[PDB]
Amino acid sequence: MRITFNDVKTSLGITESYDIVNAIRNFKSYVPLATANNVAEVGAGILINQTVQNDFITSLVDRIGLVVIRQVSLNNPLKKFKKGQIPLGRTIEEIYTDITKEKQYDAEEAEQKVFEREMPNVKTLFHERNRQGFYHQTIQDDSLKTAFVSWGNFESFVSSIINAIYNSAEVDEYEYMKLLVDNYYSKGLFTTVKIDEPTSSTGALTEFVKKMRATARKLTLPQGSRDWNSMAVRTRSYMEDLHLIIDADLEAELDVDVLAKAFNMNRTDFLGNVTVIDGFASTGLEAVLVDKDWFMVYDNLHKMETVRNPRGLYWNYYYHVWQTLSVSRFANAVAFVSGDVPAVTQVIVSPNIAAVKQGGQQQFTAYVRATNAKDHKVVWSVEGGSTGTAITGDGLLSVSGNEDNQLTVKATVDIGTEDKPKLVVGEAVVSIRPN
Amino acid sequence: YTDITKEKQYDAEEAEQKVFEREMPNVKTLFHERNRQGFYHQTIQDDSLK
Amino acid sequence: IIDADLEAELDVDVLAKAFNMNRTDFLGNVTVIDGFASTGLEAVLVDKDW
Amino acid sequence: YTDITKEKQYDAEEAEQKVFEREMPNVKTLFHERNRQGFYHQTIQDDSLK
Lengths: 435, 50, 50, 50
Hints:
Chain A: Homohexamer. Homopentamer. The prolate capsid is composed of pentamers and hexamers of the capsid protein. Chain A: Keywords: Capsid protein, Coiled coil, Late protein, T=3 icosahedral capsid protein, Virion. Chain A: Its main location: virion. The structure is cut from a larger assembly and holds four copies of chain A. Chain A is α+β, with helices and mostly antiparallel strands and 435 residues long. Chain A is built from ten helices and 20 strands. Chain A has helices at 5-11, 21-24, 40-46, 50-73, 107-112, 142-145, 151-187, 202-219, 248-253, 259-262, and strands at residues 82-85, 93-94, 124-125, 127-134, 137-140, 243-247, 274-277, 287-290, 295-309, 314-327, 333-334, 344-349, 354-357, 361-363, 366-370, 379-381, 390-391, 396-398, 407-413, 424-433. In chain A, the strands form six sheets. In chain A, strands 1, 4, 5, 9 and 10 form a five-stranded mixed β-sheet that branches. In chain A, strands 7-6-8-11 form a four-stranded mixed β-sheet. In chain A, strand 9 and strand 10 form a beta hairpin. In chain A, helix 4 crosses helix 7. The longest helix of chain A has 37 residues, at 151-187. Chain A is elongated, with a radius of gyration of 30 Å. Chain A binds chain B through residues 1, 132-138, 160, 163-164, 167-169, 171-172, 175, 307, 309, 312, 314, 316, 320-322, and chain B through 2, 4-10, 19-23. Strand 4 (127-134) of chain A pairs antiparallel with strand 1 of chain B.
């Protein structure tokens, strides 16, 4: 947020003053082409007439500012979530191959079936969120005339015209990240861990620290857990790839050490794996622990445009940044809430979307994200409406012949009482193909 | 000093009505200064030059 | 070779101080699994060439 | 596909505040999908056909 001439001098392949503006570029016989100590001559050449003045200021602002801001935005502390331009044909579809055990080697078993497929790749759709905005600013003719006294004034002017846009964009990036985290939590796709007001006392603080350490150790199990993630798909995470987004008050109450001792890092390599924000503004969310690949951001474009007001003798330059943010549905993501969260958070059906023939069968299993140690019972419903289309209590659904309608399997859990105005359901879309 | 602000949402319908608009004043202020001027001075003898 | 729950309960330090290593070269000599499923087996300490 | 537009009357006095007004084009779109997948199967038992 304190960009100086050193940053632009490193971003560009030039030293101090330059004539690349009048190299790209009649303009030739108006300004001297020397880069000597003289500044009055170049100032007079620039300010001789409005056409040359406007052309020079447009080239400078647009090209130089765009290059510098694009180069400096790619090296901010939160640059590990930043990707390049969006690839062509991304198809917004995410495919994950579920990991399973091996099949025993048996010639008698192998000789009967050799062309048989294995299993569907449990496809899903990306969770997207796009942003597009502008900042814009103004520069006066007075503080362009009073900028050619010395070569230091020119670089101070350039740094001043870049700094405002850069700092505003950098500040807004954190707010957009917090908004994305809030939206994901409100969607209910996190896996929840209950804590009890870590800042209330000292025992709550150490209990929260121990719970975080246990959660990280369970996440980084080499064999896989499947207990986390918005869909139970048996993925495994890394001790060195987990990222923590924590509340400002919570991190202020906590210390740099012991928090890093819970992980395997030691302060220096841990401060780069934690993000600090002032309040989550979502019920009682305290700190969110996600995988490194959970959150990504692509940039559609960055553009800078200048216009001139001749009646008022000034310029307005607008900086437009358009980019999209995507959170993956397969990476691990833990909410760590301290509130009045229900006993059951979400129920997930493993087969997800499936296709079956007119007289086939399918097995659906359900995983319930229970925040307590009590076991819950799941009831199965078919909705739809037909003859012979019913699903057993263990999740086996057989499709009767002569069927045309599209049906959805539902798994329901009840955590209420005699009056139960609270239902949590999981939906699986089943398609039918004629046989 | 230029104050840090949020970003305006992209809206062509609102943009086409106003394009020469300025942004904000730059909250000018003056420095708090204090000037120091003094001397110390010392003497050297001819004996401790010989 | 230690159970996952026991490894989580134990801190990374002192366990390494029991040996002569210090964390960085100690995590390379420990394997963590989830459950042994053998009565009351907790952790097994073996030679490298075992 | 893009379609034709309308005509407006020249008005210099009203042109001084409607420079950046927008008149979106008439654009229509259509989609076509792949809808045939078949195969023909035959067998040749030439050794017995001889």
